[PDB]
């Protein structure tokens, strides 16, 4: 058939900074007849459906920012964003359409922005869980940057990994910053014979941690 | 404005089929062609087929050739897709895409998406608990509440806040599956000088198992 092979598979850049992803067809999508090459590009953004961007190789679709331009002919086909704006993130796919449908494996652009602390938010479990046998204790991390923040769950002052479960957004199309949930998963008992409760939040680059306690005797 | 309406999400057993329907409004339904496209969770997105609405003529991607039927109805200018005998490799988003015949056939509108989950596992209704801040905390200028929305399936789910008429920031943190069932949670952020003053309730609904809950925040 026709195959179509994208890179980079994905990238990161900062808000004004100009990229070229690719997009590379086993055959040619140029039809003979008309001349015109038979390859569309498509914006996929966090939760959505995709969008037409480009067909025809370089016709903008109406609507789509001047920002996108396609280029290219043959097999040899071009993605170009000018200046990435915040709201750009998204899996950019191409596709051909003159030997049956088939689609490139996508590249997906992320932002890159400042460095940003969360604001951290701890909450003990609430009686009506602990009065069914369970304890979860949840931390939310927010509109933190960069993505691979590390959390760290303290209990009577000593980590436990055990049992937790992280949850990351997708990344803010507005101001650039992700946030997680962690959740620390405790039976009852476990949960009772601790008392202080501690969740740490800290870039991989620092050693100046931003922290939350509770303790469960309080309240 | 084009719009094309797919039907909500559905769980089927494997070996069963399932019908999904795309509603098309705001251009002529008989004049373009409509694609179906697979997306499974990690995203190729991948060609199943084509119906041409006013002959009823179809074309399909070999690999889905013998399980993929599609079909239209002209009087309600919908297209179907349905599938038969499936696997948990089926498990998907499902979109319907208008094709543009006479420039090609490049797809230039899409509809919503429908998520299939194939699988044996239970339709499990939600536990909802509120998560509001312990009477140890402190708050600044703004104080954040949450949601905790546990061990429901399958995954179609919606988590409302309502701060009545007060501003608010909130953070939707994607459903991890475990043992199969889902937990979930949301954040919702107001100014102190809001809470716990006015009421801001939590809303879950999980239509598959028809719940539906509300819980309030209250003052730890």
């Known amino acids: 058939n026709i195959m179509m092979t994208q890179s980079p598979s994905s990238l990161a850049v900062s808000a004004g900074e100009k990229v070229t992803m690719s997009c590379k067809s086993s055959?040619?999508?140029?039809?003979?007849?008309?001349?015109?090459?038979?390859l569309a590009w498509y914006q996929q953004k966090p939760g959505q459906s995709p969008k037409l961007l480009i067909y025809?190789?370089?016709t903008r679709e109406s609507g789509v920012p001047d920002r996108f331009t396609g280029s290219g002919s043959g097999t040899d086909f071009t993605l170009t964003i000018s200046s990435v704006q915040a709201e750009d993130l998204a899996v950019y796919y191409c596709?051909?359409?003159?030997?049956?449908?088939?689609f490139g494996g996508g590249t997906k652009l992320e932002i890159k922005r400042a460095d940003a602390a969360p604001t951290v938010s701890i909450f003990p479990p609430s009686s009506e869980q602990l009065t069914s046998g369970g304890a979860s204790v949840v931390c939310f991390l927010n509109n933190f940057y960069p993505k691979d923040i590390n959390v760290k769950w303290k209990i009577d002052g000593s980590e436990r990994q055990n049992g937790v479960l992280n949850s990351w957004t997708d990344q803010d199309s507005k101001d650039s910053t992700y946030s997680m949930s962690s959740t620390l998963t405790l039976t009852k008992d476990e949960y009772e014979r601790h008392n202080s409760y501690t969740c740490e939040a800290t870039h991989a680059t620092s050693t100046s941690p931003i922290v939350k306690s509770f303790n469960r005797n309080e309240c | 404005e084009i719009q094309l309406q797919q039907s909500g999400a559905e769980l089927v057993k494997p070996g069963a089929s399932v019908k999904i329907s795309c509603k098309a409004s705001?251009?002529?339904?008989?004049?373009?062609?409509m694609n179906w496209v697979k997306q499974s969770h990690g995203k190729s997105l991948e060609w199943i087929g084509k119906?041409?609405?006013?002959?009823?003529?179809?074309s399909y991607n070999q690999k889905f050739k013998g399980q993929a039927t599609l079909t239209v109805d002209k009087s309600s200018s919908t297209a179907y897709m349905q599938l038969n005998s499936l696997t948990s490799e089926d498990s998907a988003v499902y979109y319907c895409?208008?094709?543009?015949?006479?420039?090609?056939?490049?797809?230039?509108?899409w509809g919503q998406g429908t998520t299939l989950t194939v699988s044996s596992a239970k339709t499990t209704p939600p536990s909802v608990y509120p998560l509001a801040p312990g009477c140890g905390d402190t708050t600044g200028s703004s104080v954040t509440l949450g949601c905790l929305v546990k061990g429901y399936f399958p995954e179609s789910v919606t988590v409302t806040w309502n701060s009545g008429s007060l501003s608010s920031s909130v953070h939707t943190f994607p459903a991890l599956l475990q043992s199969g069932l889902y937990t979930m949670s949301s954040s919702v952020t107001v100014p102190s000088s809001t809470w716990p003053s006015q009421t801001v309730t939590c809303s879950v609904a999980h239509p598959a198992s028809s719940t539906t809950v509300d819980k309030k925040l209250e003052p730890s």
């Open positions: 119906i041409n609405p006013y002959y009823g003529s179809t």
């Open positions: 025809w190789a370089s």
């Open positions: 055959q040619s999508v140029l039809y003979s007849s008309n001349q015109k090459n038979y």
């Open positions: 705001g251009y002529s339904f008989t004049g373009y062609n």
């Open positions: 895409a208008r094709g543009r015949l006479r420039r090609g056939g490049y797809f230039d509108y």
């Open positions: 596709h051909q359409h003159l030997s049956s449908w088939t």
